[PDB]
């Protein structure tokens, strides 16, 4: 096949102008889409807070309007899913990945409304969920919509615009362009065969997407954590240790969301009334925990800089890790529209800080800053639970801008994905497609 | 397919430990190799420097001892590559892309000493060529070597260990672990078919390589440029216009590196004596220029900070670029072992700083610093010519640490790889492997 290859080499990278122009517009809309979704989640969270002030004396009535406000918005988002689009539950990255395998469809007439208003419900209520799973699945259908609308044909276009959507989706969710392209290249794409996802076009989407987000969001960064210290060569072995710690815990975490998917399904058995109620009770608990123990609720981006700087006790870091493990399961395993990415950065930060702390006491000859070990553990649960370490690495690099820690961040990430693989553990976006395709058949 | 897919998903990312333990060992060797290649090149640049000392009076004698030190070292490399390993001329990245398609051979017993000592020759005489083409080629051969030594079996273990070597090779050549992994994904994998390159093994190779580099090179960095300013949004369109210039000139420069490969061959006709005698005059010219105007010679990493800090005039920036466009072709199209990668980074940096200065005069309302356009243009040729912008972006990023410019950098990047496609240009590392397979059935 030498003569075939000489022909193919010469015809390399020649994406057809119609796909390159259409990637521009999918970027832009997914951009505006994500920016709105983010301004909305904010607006509800605020009104929610301005109600606690209308009631700030009667502390019993306070805990009530803290609970019902979240329960109502939770239910409203559970319901909007079961009544009009059910593949918009949970993250939704499994479903866009399935769509790249041509095993699940892109019902953009129904999920666009359901995911967006459904997320706004669960996210605005202060449940422990991200913006990523939502802007990603949303960004995907926004790609399909423009496909079906301009009726472009071929595999390249359907797979490219489906990709650029899902990529520009995650770019605009984290002001993280490189992370999004890398997310499609490392994780989203079909992992057992070839692909015609034009990568140049995914770039054009991401560019437009990120430019839209910049228009509405500059002068304030999602995480500001400032320049930390460097990492000396004789400290690396400590991050590889920290990585092994993530490697044996990554698979343990995947098992819990799946079993808890099961264990929570036993409460509603499919019954759409038992389920929408269970959502309110889960949602209302976060809105309450939001008021009375705020580090255990919400998406957890707010306690990332606090933990890094060292401002939590080792005691409080333990409390937050347990409680936030528990609430992330209750919120994500339940099916409520929203992702688990964001909550996994917090849990990861909150761990590495606790490690850095112990690392400091045991070795003062190292002159350790405990915040370098939290920057390393941030992208660490993404390595050992979803096995996309190159993405979480460039993601954490894009958000915290501490490049001098590139090696300990890599080292800890390989540390985690290797021990995860070796201890018998499954990538989480893939072990969810499996149980979802397994039932799209075992019913026959 | 669903039965198929459900079975494959549940069994995803399970690289045979054998392959992983063997990946760590590839990068440890490609690192030391890459470390030692670079210590060599410096050492001989120093001799040329210190032997210019003893002859610092007779200005004609001085001009000549730099000619001879460079010309003699130049020749040793043209010969060592003609006599013992011809595929180790030029950069060698085409040759490893060839190898991954199972369309070229990996002669490690031959190319490692040819490339290594051949490169110390052309690099150390101060020829317009970088360490990357050499270290990437060396690195795969090194990852092939261990395969054989342990008799590991499979296409995976052959394609993995050959890759984790070429990545951990570009990593140790620029202290660029991400831009290491990105090359294998973006440019040096089988580009038309799925393959069983285990990313998780490429990774473990890049770590071990880089850790080796940091053991012999820390506290110091190859390009230090400061922290330049930020880029207002009412400024991004200037970074589109830049990419449009790179987008058209990218392919033009590809025609010349391809064209002049053919025209230097007409000189020596393929004859090891007409050829080694030619590259000794090329290599002896670079050693003379490196003194009478050193910015028109060498790899070019010296002038990048002098350029980005706005320290050049508009004139000197026009000279340095044209002069370097010339000495770049002469060194690489002669086949002398050494990459064109780094001598392009210098090209884009020079072009950026020029565009930068022009903007600063037309738009004082934008409060501009030309340095930012230098950082935008730095990876712009590596986007318009070798057409690998994701690796180029992340490379310049990992080397200049001005992440606040990631948006103009991505916009100039695409602005080239787009306008190059729309002016009929070709991935140069595949316009070579193309031509190098064309005579292999002719």
């Amino acid at each position, epitope marked *: 096949r030498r003569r075939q290859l000489i022909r193919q080499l010469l015809e390399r990278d020649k994406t057809p102008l119609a796909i390159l122009f259409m990637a521009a517009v999918v970027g832009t809309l997914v951009g505006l889409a994500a920016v709105a979704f983010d301004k909305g989640v904010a607006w509800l969270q605020n009104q929610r807070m301005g109600a606690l002030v209308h009631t700030a004396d009667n502390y019993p009535l306070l805990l009530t309007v803290a609970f019902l406000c979240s329960a109502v918005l939770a239910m409203f988002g559970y319901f909007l899913v079961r009544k009009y689009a059910p593949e918009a539950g949970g993250s939704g990255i499994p479903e866009i990945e399935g769509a790249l395998e041509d095993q699940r469809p892109v019902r953009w007439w129904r999920v666009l409304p359901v995911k967006f208003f459904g997320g706004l419900g669960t996210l605005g209520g202060g449940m422990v969920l991200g913006r990523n799973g939502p802007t990603v699945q949303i960004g995907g259908n926004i790609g399909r919509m423009v496909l079906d609308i301009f009726r472009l044909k071929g595999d390249e276009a359907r797979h490219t615009l489906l990709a650029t959507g899902a990529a520009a989706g995650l770019a605009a969710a984290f002001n993280a362009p490189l992370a999004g392209i890398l997310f499609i290249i490392e994780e989203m794409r079909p992992q057992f065969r070839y692909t015609l996802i034009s990568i140049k076009a995914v770039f054009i989407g991401v560019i437009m997407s990120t430019i839209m987000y910049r228009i509405f969001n500059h002068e304030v960064a999602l995480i500001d954590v400032g320049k930390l210290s460097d990492a*000396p060569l004789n400290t690396l072995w400590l991050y590889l240790i920290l990585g092994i710690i993530f490697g044996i815990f990554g698979p343990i975490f995947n098992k819990w969301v799946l079993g808890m998917q099961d264990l929570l399904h036993r409460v509603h058995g499919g019954n759409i009334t038992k389920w929408v109620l269970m959502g309110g009770a889960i949602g209302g608990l976060c809105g309450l925990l939001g008021f009375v123990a705020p580090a255990t609720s919400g998406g957890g981006f707010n306690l990332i800089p606090i933990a890094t700087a060292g401002n939590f006790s080792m005691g409080m870091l333990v409390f937050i890790f347990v409680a936030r493990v528990i609430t992330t399961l209750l919120c994500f395993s339940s099916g409520a529209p929203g992702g688990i990415f964001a909550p996994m950065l917090a849990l990861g930060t909150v761990l590495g800080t606790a490690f850095g702390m112990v690392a*400091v006491e045991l070795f003062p*000859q190292y*002159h350790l800053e405990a915040g370098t070990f939290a920057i390393a553990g941030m992208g660490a649960l993404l390595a050992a639970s979803i096995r996309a370490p190159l993405t979480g690495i460039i993601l954490v690099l894009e958000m915290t801008d501490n490049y001098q820690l590139i090696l300990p961040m890599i080292i800890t990430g390989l540390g985690a994905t290797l021990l995860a693989q070796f201890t018998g553990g499954k990538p989480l976006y893939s072990a969810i497609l499996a149980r979802t395709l397994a039932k799209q058949e075992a019913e026959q | 397919r669903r039965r198929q897919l459900i079975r494959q998903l549940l069994e995803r990312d399970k690289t045979p430990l054998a392959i992983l333990f063997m990946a760590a060992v590839v990068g440890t060797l490609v690192g030391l190799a890459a470390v030692a290649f670079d210590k060599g090149v410096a050492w001989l640049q120093n001799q040329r420097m210190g032997a210019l000392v003893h002859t610092a009076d007779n200005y004609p004698l001085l001009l000549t001892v730099a000619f001879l030190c460079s010309a003699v070292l130049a020749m040793f490399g043209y010969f060592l590559v003609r006599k013992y390993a011809p595929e180790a001329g030029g950069s060698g990245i085409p040759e490893i892309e060839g190898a991954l398609e199972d369309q070229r051979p990996v002669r490690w017993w031959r190319v490692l000493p040819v490339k290594f000592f051949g490169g110390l020759g052309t690099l150390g005489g101060g020829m317009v060529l970088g360490r990357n083409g050499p270290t990437v080629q060396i690195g795969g051969n090194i990852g092939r070597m261990v395969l054989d030594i342990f008799r590991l079996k499979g296409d995976e273990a052959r394609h993995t260990l050959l890759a984790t070597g070429a990545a951990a090779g570009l990593a140790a050549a620029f202290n660029a672990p991400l831009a290491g992994i990105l090359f294998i994904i973006e440019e040096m994998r089988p580009q038309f078919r799925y393959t069983l390159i285990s990313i998780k093994a490429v990774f473990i190779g890049v770590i071990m390589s880089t850790i080796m580099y940091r053991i012999f090179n*820390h*506290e110091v960095a190859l390009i230090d440029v400061g922290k330049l300013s930020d880029a207002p949004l009412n400024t991004l369109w200037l970074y589109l216009i830049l990419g449009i210039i790179f987008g058209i000139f990218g392919p033009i420069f590809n025609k010349w590196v391809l064209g002049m490969q053919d025209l230097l061959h007409r000189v020596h006709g393929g004859n090891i004596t007409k050829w080694v005698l030619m590259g000794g005059a090329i290599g002896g010219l670079c050693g003379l220029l490196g003194f009478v105007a050193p910015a028109t010679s060498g790899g070019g990493f010296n002038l990048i900070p002098i350029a980005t800090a706005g320290n050049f005039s508009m004139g000197m920036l026009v000279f340095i670029f044209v002069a370097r466009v010339i000495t770049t072709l002469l060194c690489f199209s002669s086949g002398a072992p050494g990459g064109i990668f780094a001598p392009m980074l210098a090209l884009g940096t020079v072009l950026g700083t020029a565009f930068g200065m022009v903007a600063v005069e037309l738009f004082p309302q934008y409060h501009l610093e030309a340095g930012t356009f230098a950082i935008a243009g730095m990876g712009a040729l590596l986007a318009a010519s070798i057409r690998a912008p994701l690796t180029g972006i992340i490379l310049v990023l990992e080397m200049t640490d001005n992440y606040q410019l990631i948006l103009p950098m991505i916009i100039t990047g695409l602005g080239a790889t787009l306008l190059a496609q729309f002016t009929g240009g070709k991935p140069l590392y595949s316009a070579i492997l193309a031509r190098t397979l064309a005579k292999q059935e002719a």
Partner: antibody
Amino acid sequence: EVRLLESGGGLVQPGGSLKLSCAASGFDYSRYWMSWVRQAPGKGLKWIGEINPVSSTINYTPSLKDKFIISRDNAKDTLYLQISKVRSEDTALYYCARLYYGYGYWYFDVWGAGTTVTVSS
Amino acid sequence: DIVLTQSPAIMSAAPGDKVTMTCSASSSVSYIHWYQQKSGTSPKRWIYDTSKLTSGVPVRFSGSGSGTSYSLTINTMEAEDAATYYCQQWSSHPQTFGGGTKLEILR
């Protein structure tokens, strides 16, 4: 140049106290750990303590409680050392050091001129 | 804490002459540093990480060693080399300097 200039030593009476001051010039005084090391007349170098840029970890040698107080004033680019309950043992030449490392085995990077403390009645 | 003892407490040696002092340790120690103190001047960092010369230290200086026994050496001494060489470790907390070795000219 990089200049470490300490002052503040002199004659002090047993039981007294003094506050030595090291003023920095020629480098970002933040981002650096700073350290105090003294040298009794006719003896070797002895380590007092250190202090990280955000003042969030201060380490002093095995020597008593509020004997030593190391502080820094990043805004003034000055390093301070307070010695209390001064003995004759505290008569020495006091040095100011900027800490760094190589492989991560930390060394005393650039030293200052010194200042002398005399503890006599 | 770890004790360092620099062995030739005082010593002399002619110019153009090999000189060799010692730093020993009560427990094992990693990567030692050396400072050269001339009377009236701040101690100068001289040699770090068991072996690595500092910028400006002339190439006649060198160190090597391992575990619990390192040393410093001058291939060909000079006049300017007369001073006091302090070893100091930080492989263990807290760091410790040695007693000193006074290097005097022999004449």
